[PDB]
Amino acid sequence: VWVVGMGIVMSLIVLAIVFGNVLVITAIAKFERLQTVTNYFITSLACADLVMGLAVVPFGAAHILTKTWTFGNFWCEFWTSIDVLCVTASIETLCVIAVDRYFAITSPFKYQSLLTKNKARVIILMVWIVSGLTSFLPIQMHWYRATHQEAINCYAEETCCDFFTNQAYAIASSIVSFYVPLVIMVFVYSRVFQEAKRQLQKIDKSEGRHKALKTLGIIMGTFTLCWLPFFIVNIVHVIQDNLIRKEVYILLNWIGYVNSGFNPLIYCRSPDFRIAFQELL
Numbered sequence: 464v465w466v467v468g469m470g471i472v473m474s475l476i477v478l479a480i481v482f483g484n485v486l487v488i489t490a491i492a493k494f495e496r497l498q499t500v501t502n503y504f505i506t507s508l509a510c511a512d513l514v515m516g517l518a519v520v521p522f523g524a525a526h527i528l529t530k531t532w533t534f535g536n537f538w539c540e541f542w543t544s545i546d547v548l549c550v551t552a553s554i555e556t557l558c559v560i561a562v563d564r565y566f567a568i569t570s571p572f573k574y575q576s577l578l579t580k581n582k583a584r585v586i587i588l589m590v591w592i593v594s595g596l597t598s599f600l601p602i603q604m605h606w607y608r609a610t611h612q613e614a615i616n617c618y619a620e621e622t623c624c625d626f627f628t629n630q631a632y633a634i635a636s637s638i639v640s641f642y643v644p645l646v647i648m649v650f651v652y653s654r655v656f657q658e659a660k661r662q663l664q665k666i667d668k669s670e671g672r673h674k675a676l677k678t679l680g681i682i683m684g685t686f687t688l689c690w691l692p693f694f695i696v697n698i699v700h701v702i703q704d705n706l707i708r709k710e711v712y713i714l715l716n717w718i719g720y721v722n723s724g725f726n727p728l729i730y731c732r733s734p735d736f737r738i739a740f741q742e743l744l
């Protein structure tokens with residue numbers, strides 16, 4: 464009776480993920496006003512989320528719901544590669560938009576000539592290139608396989624799909640995909656909050672005839688509680704401890720998919736963008 468029960472949630476998530484990006488892509492495509500410099504980064508994030516939801520979520524849900532994998536193992540390598548690539552692309556896009564906000568707040572005069580529409584495209588292309596390289600190159604060249612005789616049959620056989628990684632690769636991947644964006648975002652947001660507090664104090668100096676924290680409170684919090692634990696797990700099993708189980712690993716990886724799906728809708732709200740949605744509907 465649980466098979467039908469778990470199917471409903473997966474189907475709802477799959478239906479919602481694509482609709483949460485088609486609307487934004489279509490609205491930003493055919494509206495002149497919504498076009499801006501940060502709009503390119505927003506579209507990059509939305510397209511990455513759409514690709515993730517259209518590619519990895521349905522097949523992964525089919526694998527989880529079914530007893531055993533259906534087709535051959537030839538496509539599995541870049542299935543996993545696309546998964547890791549989209550995750551890295553989303554994380555790095557959030558890091559770069561945070562850096563953009565930091566540059567916007569601190570130096571107003573330089574921002575006019577520092578960033579240009581022509582120069583902005585280079586950053587997105589470079590980050591896509593580096594994420595795609597660090598995703599495809601290790602996965603496809605079979606540099607991530609392990610030597611332990613356990614599950615080597617699963618790697619050899621074309622009927623089961625389990626994720627097994629070497630000690631070295633996991634740590635480097637976690638460091639290059641999670642920790643650096645986290646520290647950069649934390650530092651830049653601390654600086655932004657300090658600037659906002661200073662401005663509020665200056666305004667209060669001449670008055671009499673912190674709400675903004677809430678605006679920050681979500682934008683980082685939903686990132687932490689939804690992505691901090693998994694990578695913390697993604698290292699410990701490399702250590703000699705056998706504490707975690709496969710089901711827990713699968714569930715913590717799964718939660719990240721829902722987090723990535725829900726991120727862009729919460730991230731981008733504006734009266735102009737709201738009326739942009741309104742006109743299309």
Ligand SMILES: CN[C@@H]1CCc2c(ccc(O)c2O)[C@H]1O
Binds near residue numbers: 546550626633636
């Ligand atoms: C099988 N799922 C994978 C397993 C490990 C992993 C993921 C995503 C980004 C990474 O940097 C990873 O090391 C997960 O999506």
